[PDB]
Each structure stands twice: as structure tokens, then as C-alpha cells.
Design a protein around this ligand. Sequence first.
Ligand code: NAG
Ligand code: NAG
Lengths: 38, 114
Amino acid sequence: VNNSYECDIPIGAGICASYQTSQSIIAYTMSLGAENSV
Amino acid sequence: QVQLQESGGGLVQAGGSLRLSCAASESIFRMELMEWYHQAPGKQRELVATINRCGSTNYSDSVKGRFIISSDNAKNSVYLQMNSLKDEDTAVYSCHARTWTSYWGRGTQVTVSS
Ligand SMILES: *[C@@H]1O[C@H](CO)[C@@H](O)[C@H](O)[C@H]1NC(C)=O
Ligand SMILES: *[C@@H]1O[C@H](CO)[C@@H](O)[C@H](O)[C@H]1NC(C)=O
């Protein structure tokens, strides 16, 4: 998956996986959090 | 190895019958659950029919009474007999399978003429 989310399960090297509504389990690059600008 | 290979689609007149032969090299028993999907060009894919290892069968509203599922335990394949084909069955029917991991086949177009 291209989209990024919070890490649910850690696998390593900035990759994370979770179960969601193809493969039942998906993998994605972890997102550090919501972006902001001041 | 090709897995879930499909065969039996093509051109057919309205109201006819047809047979498609999605077959896979794997043990038909262990796979435990097989489905069917068609995707009319421009129409989001949609589930057709389902059947589990136990034997329970479900169909969509536009499916029952016209074509039912079947699977002989002699040659590893799932049989679904098209009957009384109409124009809005024109789509790309694909058989889908899932053991502990997902499996997918190439599908096959279906065209009905009127
Ligand atoms: C989306 O993912 C595909 C394959 O995973 C990749 O080829 C493509 O570059 C990605 N696009 C974006 C915008 O992330
Ligand atoms: C597995 O079962 C199929 C029928 O479902 C049969 O044709 C085949 O010979 C069987 N294989 C073994 C190793 O028992």
C-alpha cells in the first residue's frame, strides 16, 4: 500500500502491517504522525 | 503452477448456456473456500457465487435460479454452468481462492449478444 498510517505491528526498517478491509493483511511505510506548520 | 486458470468464456447468443472451467493444480480440499467475481468494463468488480469446504453455498440476487456452483472431487476444478444468458452478464468473470493466503486468477471475458 502506498498510503501511510500509524504503526500497528512492527516488522522493521520503517515498514508496518495491519489488518483492514487482494490480501487480508497489508504492509506500508510508517508515518511519524500528522504534518503541521506554524 | 499457473493456478486458478480459467477457461470457457467468449461469445454467445442471449438465452444460451455456457461452461467455464476454473481449475488449479492445488488440492481442492485444503483450499477450503472458492468464489467468483466479474467486472463489467467500467463497473466495479462484484462477487458472483461462493462455496466453502463444508458445502454451504450462497449466490447474489442476480445469480440464483440461473447458474449454480459445482465442484467435482475428481479433477481439481470448480464448475459453474451458465444458463439463459442475458445482456447484462457481459463482464470478466474470475474465480478467486483463499487458503491461509490469497490466490487470484486471470479471469475471462463473457459477451452476450442480442
Ligand atoms: C503506488 O504504488 C505502486 C506500487 O506499489 C507504485 O508503483 C507507485 O509509484 C505508487 N504511487 C504513489 C503515488 O505512491
Ligand atoms: C487427491 O484427490 C484427488 C481427487 O480429489 C485425486 O485425483 C488425487 O489422486 C488425490 N491425490 C492423492 C495423493 O491422494
